[PDB]
Amino acid sequence: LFVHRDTPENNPETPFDFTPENYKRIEAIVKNYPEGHKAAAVLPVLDLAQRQNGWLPISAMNKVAEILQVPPMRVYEVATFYTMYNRKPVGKYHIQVCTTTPCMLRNSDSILEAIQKKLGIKVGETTPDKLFTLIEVECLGACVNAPMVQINDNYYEDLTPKDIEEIIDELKAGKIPKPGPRSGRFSCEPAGGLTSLTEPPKGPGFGVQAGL
Amino acid sequence: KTSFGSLKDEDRIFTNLYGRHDWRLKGAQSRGDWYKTKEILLKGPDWILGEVKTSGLRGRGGAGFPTGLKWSFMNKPSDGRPKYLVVNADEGEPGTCKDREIIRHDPHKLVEGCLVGGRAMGARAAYIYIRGEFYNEASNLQVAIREAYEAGLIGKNACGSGYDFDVFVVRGAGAYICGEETALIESIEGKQGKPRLKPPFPADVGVFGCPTTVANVETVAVSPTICRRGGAWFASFGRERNSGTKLFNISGHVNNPCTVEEEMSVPLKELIEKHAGGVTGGWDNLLAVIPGGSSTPLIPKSVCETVLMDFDALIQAQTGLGTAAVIVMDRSTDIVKAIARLIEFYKHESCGQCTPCREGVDWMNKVMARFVRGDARPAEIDSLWEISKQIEGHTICALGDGAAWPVQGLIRHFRPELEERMQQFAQQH
Amino acid sequence: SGVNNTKKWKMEFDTRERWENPLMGWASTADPLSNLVLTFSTKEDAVAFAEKNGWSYDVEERKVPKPKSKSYGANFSWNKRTRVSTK
Numbered sequence: 001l002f003v004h005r006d007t008p009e010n011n012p013e014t015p016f017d018f019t020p021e022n023y024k025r026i027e028a029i030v031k032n033y034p035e036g037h038k039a040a041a042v043l044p045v046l047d048l049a050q051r052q053n054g055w056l057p058i059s060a061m062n063k064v065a066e067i068l069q070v071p072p073m074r075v076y077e078v079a080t081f082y083t084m085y086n087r088k089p090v091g092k093y094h095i096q097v098c099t100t101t102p103c104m105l106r107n108s109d110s111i112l113e114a115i116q117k118k119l120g121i122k123v124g125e126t127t128p129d130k131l132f133t134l135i136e137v138e139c140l141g142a143c144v145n146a147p148m149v150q151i152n153d154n155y156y157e158d159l160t161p162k163d164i165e166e167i168i169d170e171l172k173a174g175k176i177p178k179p180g181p182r183s184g185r186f187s188c189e190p191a192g193g194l195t196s197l198t199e200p201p202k203g204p205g206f207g208v209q210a211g212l
Numbered sequence: 213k214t215s216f217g218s219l220k221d222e223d224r225i226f227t228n229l230y231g232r233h234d235w236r237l238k239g240a241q242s243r244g245d246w247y248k249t250k251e252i253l254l255k256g257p258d259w260i261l262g263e264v265k266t267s268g269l270r271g272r273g274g275a276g277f278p279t280g281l282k283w284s285f286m287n288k289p290s291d292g293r294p295k296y297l298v299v300n301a302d303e304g305e306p307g308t309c310k311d312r313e314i315i316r317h318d319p320h321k322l323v324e325g326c327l328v329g330g331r332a333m334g335a336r337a338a339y340i341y342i343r344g345e346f347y348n349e350a351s352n353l354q355v356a357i358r359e360a361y362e363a364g365l366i367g368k369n370a371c372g373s374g375y376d377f378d379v380f381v382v383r384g385a386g387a388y389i390c391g392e393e394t395a396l397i398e399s400i401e402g403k404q405g406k407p408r409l410k411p412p413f414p415a416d417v418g419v420f421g422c423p424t425t426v427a428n429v430e431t432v433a434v435s436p437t438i439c440r441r442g443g444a445w446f447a448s449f450g451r452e453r454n455s456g457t458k459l460f461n462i463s464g465h466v467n468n469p470c471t472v473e474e475e476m477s478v479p480l481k482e483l484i485e486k487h488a489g490g491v492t493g494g495w496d497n498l499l500a501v502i503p504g505g506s507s508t509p510l511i512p513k514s515v516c517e518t519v520l521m522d523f524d525a526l527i528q529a530q531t532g533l534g535t536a537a538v539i540v541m542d543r544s545t546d547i548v549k550a551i552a553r554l555i556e557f558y559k560h561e562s563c564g565q566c567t568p569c570r571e572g573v574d575w576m577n578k579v580m581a582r583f584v585r586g587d588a589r590p591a592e593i594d595s596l597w598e599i600s601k602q603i604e605g606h607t608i609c610a611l612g613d614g615a616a617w618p619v620q621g622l623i624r625h626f627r628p629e630l631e632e633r634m635q636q637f638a639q640q641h
Numbered sequence: 642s643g644v645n646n647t648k649k650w651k652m653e654f655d656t657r658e659r660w661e662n663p664l665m666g667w668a669s670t671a672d673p674l675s676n677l678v679l680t681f682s683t684k685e686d687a688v689a690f691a692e693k694n695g696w697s698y699d700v701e702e703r704k705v706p707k708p709k710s711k712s713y714g715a716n717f718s719w720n721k722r723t724r725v726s727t728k
């Protein structure tokens with residue numbers, strides 16, 4: 001929903017303030033923009049509150065409005081426009097499965113159902129332990145590595161039902177699995193052998209025209 | 213020349229595309245980056261704009277405007293306002309992941325491009341807008357920028373050239389529409405990512421209200437090489453008015469989905485077979501290809517037999533080069549469902565600002581969802597065509613066109629499939 | 642926003658008493674001119690008509706909206722207050 005209703009857990013009196021170290025980070029954010037245009041810092045600072053707090057209560061939105069001297073409504077507009085802001089609490093690991101056509105064509109559905117069975121939840125829900133939250137997202141910009149998921153800040157790619165269940169098993173154990181493809185390649189090169197960039201790259205000055 | 217493709221590694225620009233060599237400053241310099249940057253800067257903006265003009269380079273962000281002419285809009289006297297370069301790293305087009313490889317594996321190409329391109333425009337700084345999901349890539353770029361600052365390649369007296377230049381990185385927060393040039397500017401300003409009407413054009417009133425040029429990551433990252441090796445060297449690739457090398461993404465129903473650099477005007481068939489290992493199940497198993505990302509209309513196998521991958525060739529085939537993100541669908545695909553999911557994507561991504569896309573795309577999505585099940589009558593096909601034409605060319609920004617076009621491609625080339633599905637539903641009910 | 646009902650000159654008369662009908666509560670009137678409203682191309686035509694019919698009259702000069710200076714670009718001013726905080 002894109003309207004707010006005060007609750008005991010989410011209301012203007014809910015405690016939130018940036019830590020002393022995050023205030024230092026805020027100063028560097030605000031210094032990135034011309035003077036007289038502090039409102040440009042709304043997105044990075046709002047994201048900073050989420051990284052500290054995990055999600056965005058209304059009191060966190062109010063604090064950002066105060067620090068940057070912007071009307072709170074303009075901050076509410078940003079919080080509700082960009083989908084990476086969590087206006088409700090999310091589990092420790094926010095699993096985000098891409099289901100757009102390129103990933104769908106390479107069986108993102110088998111990934112989605114594998115997660116649902118293993119965690120016993122439905123898309124949109126949080127586990128009772130509050131460790132995992134599962135949602136579908138649009139193209140995450142790793143289409144040649146489909147099917148893939150993002151968990152918090154990391155991408156996990158070239159997934160199969162076995163691979164994702166192994167990633168979730170590692171997460172449940174406190175281990176932090178390595179990101180990237182799980183199929184054998186390292187990034188976006190074709191499997192079965194490079195079809196380009198096999199020879200060593202040229203060095204400084206190669207092919208440089210005259211006059212420089 | 214009359215045949216294109218088979219680009220040699222000596223002529224490839226992004227030589228660390230696969231990240232098998234050091235992506236940091238030392239590896240970049242060993243590969244030719246940051247070489248004679250001072251000389252290029254001291255040549256002057258008009259010389260730099262001349263080389264980009266002669267190179268025939270066109271925008272790699274999806275619209276394909278001639279880059280040299282576009283960048284020359286900033287080559288004008290100052291008026292007290294600062295001038296900015298905004299590098300578009302939102303990379304949100306479904307099927308497109310080329311800009312991701314440049315940022316994380318060749319970051320110093322992009323940083324040097326910002327300085328060289330910024331110098332041509334007389335900008336004081338560059339803001340690189342990178343989508344918020346590319347966290348690890350943004351951090352990689354941030355590390356490279358610090359090395360450039362420490363080495364004195366950017367910042368005060370960049371490359372000892374007497375020209376100051378800052379490179380800032382700002383992350384998005386989840387919005388495909390923030391790849392649109394004016395929506396990107398609005399997002400940097402702390403507002404909802406809603407596009408601006410034009411005029412004014414960004415070269416007159418842009419970010420913070422100042423003269424601005426928005427350029428795609430790949431467009432920027434190739435400019436330093438064009439200056440070093442010459443625009444003529446770049447124009448010796450691809451057909452006339454389709455110059456240069458191009459980064460391709462081949463995904464979907466291929467054997468080895470991959471990113472690769474190849475000559476412009478390469479045949480679509482040759483690209484899929486040489487680099488992606490061919491269509492899954494053989495070329496005979498091909499059904500349709502989306503050649504330039506979800507915003508470009510699909511083309512059937514018959515068209516894919518001989519078409520060339522460049523701006524002009526794909527326009528004559530009733531589509532476009534777009535981002536050159538090739539999405540391949542074999543004959544096991546439910547083509548109506550594939551397209552219906554793209555319309556669902558545009559429904560989730562429309563900013564909602566202007567009426568035809570706010571309401572039209574959601575309307576098209578509802579009709580397509582029924583077309584998937586066959587729960588419609590054939591008269592609704594011509595209705596859906598007309599609706600898509602009421603969105604196209606009537607919206608503020610090109611997202612509305614980007615949603616209309618995929619629907620048009622489906623109806624143009626697969627009307628029998630849509631009608632067959634309605635016939636099957638009717639007998640079952 | 643339509644301006645098509647502001648093209649012509651009108652002539653109406655002074656409002657007189659309306660009272661509640663004792664039976665039904667309907668609005669009764671004894672003013673035969675209560676509904677009379679004439680239309681004229683110009684105020685000269687209206688004045689001419691009023692003069693020959695012996696009615697005393699007041700003429701109010703037509704109010705036309707004054708031309709405004711509009712600029713979409715001002716929504717994003719670098720240093721002026723016209724910059725919009727939202728779209």
Ligand SMILES: Cc1cc2nc3c(=O)[nH]c(=O)nc-3n(C[C@H](O)[C@H](O)[C@H](O)COP(=O)(O)O)c2cc1C
Nearest residue numbers: 271272273300303304391392393427428431610611
């Ligand atoms: C909905 C939409 C999304 C877009 N996304 C991107 C993008 O992710 N990256 C990009 O470079 N251009 C994107 N564009 C194109 C930009 O608006 C603009 O044309 C481009 O940044 C100009 O740079 P170029 O001339 O070098 O291509 C998008 C356009 C639209 C309408």
Ligand code: SF4
Nearest residue numbers: 563565566569607609
């Ligand atoms: S076409 Fe869609 S995305 Fe573009 S301005 Fe209109 S509503 Fe927003």
Ligand code: FES
Nearest residue numbers: 098103139140142
């Ligand atoms: S379609 Fe899933 S990452 Fe692009």
